[PDB]
């Protein structure tokens, strides 16, 4: 999910784009600069819901899900040697040759774990003015403007993977916060023609496991999965408009069931489902200044 | 802390370059090389104060902190795919196609260690004019001009990482000291137009163990960070004025106490009495 | 208040319309456009009453009128690009009859 | 919003004279300024696209030239069907203006 959205089904209507950004317009001076959302590549996240498990109240104990290992394959490399249809020629003189396939900066993120991704802001120029509407920017967090200090790093520019296809790749990068519940891979390779590289196998996987053996452990009883995988961008015979690609990349998790030990009293969290399943009401005061309440006695025996 | 300071922080006073080099601007003449203060990019330290631990100062036994593992990690990376806004384009005859992302040279070093980052000095040209005031140079540690061993190794040229954002990077690299405290890695790529690479994970770490398993020692009672991340330049739509791009790095340290036999020797105290 | 503008003997959904307005005595003027990927992009004097709009697969711009349309009068017309792009300038040679 | 002026307010010239009509634009264009003939009846029809083509079935007495903050027209041979009004417009950021 980078920058055209599936809805359009039609094949003439939405140009089929699907799969591929819309088009990458320039700026027109260093003071102005649009993005236009449906250019712009966001991540990808889906979260599976687990059923729920047993416990022991006799002992406090507890029984959740746990992430042990992880397959991951991007799958359809193949699919960037077609060499044919109308993208610039490599004999671009006469027109002739071979439609200069997939090349450029890519980027491969990947993150398994129990719990949203949690991720952070850094931008290059911060005078870009991203649409304040149906994508997740800097300003839609902190309701005020970016600032400088969000183009190295601002601790208050933080947020979470929570929604889809709305956090851009260009804004968003995973956070190392101080203790994490989640597995995140990743690599990056710039410049502007440099040859896509993409390995497959279904015999490697990948070890989720901690220092301690722990491995993402599943808050609520949901698993969550991540991903972007940007493959370069491609150039019409046109002015060179360059829309990205990208493609799906396949998860296999493999989850046990692991003992765990409850670490909050049944009276705090039977106290708090209260309060969260109750509304907050407002009623006359009845503490503080202008209580209501007149008097209070308590007797014994 | 490259170049352009954190200080202006409004978007069109300072144009906010805060991450980037201002700009570039090359030699007129091969005797006449004067950069400027704001676009050399430097080093970039830290010092972690931690709490004092024991006061056994009757055994020579006395314990003190000592950084066992780390874990690094330069943070934006992505950020570098934004390919809109106003530098040099991909197709520059019709002024089209896309604005040419972050290339060039690049340079990642980080250091963690118990004391300052101890540097050498060697510079690509010893008549470069670099401004005296607010940059280290190897003339504001020597006192008197550049000695053409200053293109080679010069064991004179030696200094350490008390300030920060002061200490440029054509001039001081670490120093492999013989006896050192401070674990530091890093990797050059040279090239004018050599693409970025890099790696995300939160997977593995680095182990500072020294070949005895000590590793940094934190005397004082400070853990020194250092580091220098840089990506490449960013060639604008005009005389194309080149300037660099850093990303942030973060460090995670696995601090333990260590018992350590006592190096304040009270025989300077009772000396320096006479 | 909602006009239509219908086009044929083309893919219309790929190609990028602009609305321009021209007054018989001070020359023309530029309104709004379009493209592909569709987003509005309007005059300075015009920004919040008119809306440019396109229902594909019906192949006519709707250029809802000011809602409010006092001191805008002028003869309306219709402006196809010429190549089938996302790029936004793109030199309309297409006009269309007049309105 | 950038603002384009053009120097020759009327020109009276009759056939086969030359005439050459300028444009400036108060910010820098790069090269995406046309040149629009308006005849009284008429869709204004595209003459020279881009400032330095001609668009398909414009005679080869249409000339445009120039690149940047100054833009020029030219015909050489006048002719009869000449007898229109020219506009330039910018197309270079948004919102265009003629």
């Known amino acids: 999910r980078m920058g055209q959205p599936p809805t359009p089904e039609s094949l003439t209507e939405g140009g089929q784009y699907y799969g591929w950004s819309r088009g990458i317009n320039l700026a027109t001076s260093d003071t102005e600069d649009s993005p236009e959302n449906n250019t712009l590549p966001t991540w990808s996240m889906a979260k599976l819901q687990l059923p729920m498990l047993n416990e022991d109240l006799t002992c406090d104990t507890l029984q959740m899900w746990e992430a042990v290992s992880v397959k991951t394959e991007v799958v359809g490399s193949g699919s960037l040697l077609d060499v044919h249809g109308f993208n610039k020629p490599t004999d671009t003189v006469n027109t002739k040759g071979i439609s200069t396939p997939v090349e450029g900066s890519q980027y491969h993120v990947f993150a398994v774990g129990g719990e949203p991704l949690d991720l952070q802001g850094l931008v290059t120029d911060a005078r870009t003015k991203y649409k304040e509407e149906g994508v997740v920017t800097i300003k839609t967090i902190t309701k005020k403007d970016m600032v400088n200090k969000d183009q190295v790093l601002n601790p208050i520019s933080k947020a979470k993977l929570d929604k889809d296809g709305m956090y851009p790749v260009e804004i968003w990068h995973p956070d190392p916060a101080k203790n994490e519940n989640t597995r995140y891979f990743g690599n990056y390779t710039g410049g502007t023609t440099t040859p896509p590289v993409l390995q497959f196998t279904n015999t490697l996987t990948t070890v989720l496991l901690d220092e301690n053996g722990v491995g993402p452990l599943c808050k609520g009883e949901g698993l969550y999965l991540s991903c972007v995988d940007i493959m370069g961008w491609r150039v019409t015979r046109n002015y060179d408009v360059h829309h990205w690609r990208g493609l799906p990349r396949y998860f296999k998790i493999t989850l046990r069931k692991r003992w765990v030990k409850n670490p909050y009293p049944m009276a705090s969290l039977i106290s708090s489902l209260f309060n969260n399943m109750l509304p907050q009401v407002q009623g006359q005061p009845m503490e503080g200044e202008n209580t209501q309440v007149e008097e209070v006695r308590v007797y014994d025996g | 802390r490259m170049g352009q300071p954190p200080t202006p922080e409004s978007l069109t006073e300072g144009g906010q370059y805060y991450g980037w080099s201002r700009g570039i601007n090359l030699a007129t003449s091969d005797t006449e090389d004067s950069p400027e203060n704001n676009t050399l990019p430097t080093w970039s330290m830290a010092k972690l104060q931690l709490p004092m631990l024991n006061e056994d100062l009757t055994c020579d036994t006395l314990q003190m902190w000592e950084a066992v593992s780390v874990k690094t990690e330069v943070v934006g990376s992505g950020s570098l795919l934004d390919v809109h806004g106003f530098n040099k384009p991909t197709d520059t005859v019709n002024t089209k196609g896309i604005s040419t992302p972050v290339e060039g040279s690049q340079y990642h070093v980080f250091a963690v260690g118990g004391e300052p980052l101890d540097l050498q000095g060697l510079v690509t040209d010893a008549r470069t004019k670099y401004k005296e005031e607010g940059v280290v140079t190897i003339k504001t540690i020597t006192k008197k001009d550049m000695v053409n061993k200053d293109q080679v190794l010069n064991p004179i040229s030696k200094a350490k990482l008390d300030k920060d954002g002061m200490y440029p990077v054509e001039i001081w690299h670490p120093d492999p000291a013989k006896n050192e405290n401070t674990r530091y890695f890093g990797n050059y790529t040279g090239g004018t137009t050599t693409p970025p690479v890099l790696q995300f994970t939160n997977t593995l770490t680095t182990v500072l163990l020294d070949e005895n398993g000590v590793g940094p020692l934190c005397k004082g009672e400070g853990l020194y960070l250092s580091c220098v991340d840089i990506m490449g330049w960013r060639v604008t739509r005009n005389y194309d004025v080149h300037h660099w791009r850093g990303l942030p790095r973060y460090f995670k340290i696995t601090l333990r106490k260590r018992w350590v036999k006592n190096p304040y020797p009270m025989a300077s105290l009772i000396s320096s009495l006479f | 208040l909602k006009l239509s503008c219908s086009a044929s003997?083309?893919?219309?959904?790929?190609?990028?319309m602009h609305w321009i307005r021209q007054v018989p005595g001070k020359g023309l003027d530029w309104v709004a456009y379009?493209?592909?990927?569709?987003?509005?992009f309007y005059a300075d004097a015009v920004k919040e009453r008119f809306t440019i709009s396109r229902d594909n697969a019906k192949n006519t711009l709707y250029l809802r009128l000011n809602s409010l349309k006092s001191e805008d009068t002028a003869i309306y017309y219709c402006a196809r690009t010429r190549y089938p792009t996302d790029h936004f300038y793109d030199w309309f040679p297409y006009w269309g009859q007049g309105t | 919003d950038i603002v384009m002026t053009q120097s020759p307010t009327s020109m009276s010239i009759s056939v086969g004279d030359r005439v050459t009509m300028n444009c400036r634009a108060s910010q820098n264009v790069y090269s995406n300024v046309d040149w629009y003939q308006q005849k009284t009846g008429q869709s204004p029809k595209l003459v020279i696209y881009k400032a330095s083509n001609r668009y398909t079935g414009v005679p080869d007495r249409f000339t445009g030239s120039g690149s940047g903050t100054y833009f020029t027209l030219t015909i050489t041979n006048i002719q009869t069907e000449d007898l229109a009004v020219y506009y330039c417009?910018?197309?270079?950021?948004?919102?265009?203006?003629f």
């Open positions: 379009i493209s592909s990927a569709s987003d509005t």
């Open positions: 417009l910018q197309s270079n950021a948004f919102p265009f203006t």
């Open positions: 003997g083309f893919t219309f959904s790929s190609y990028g």
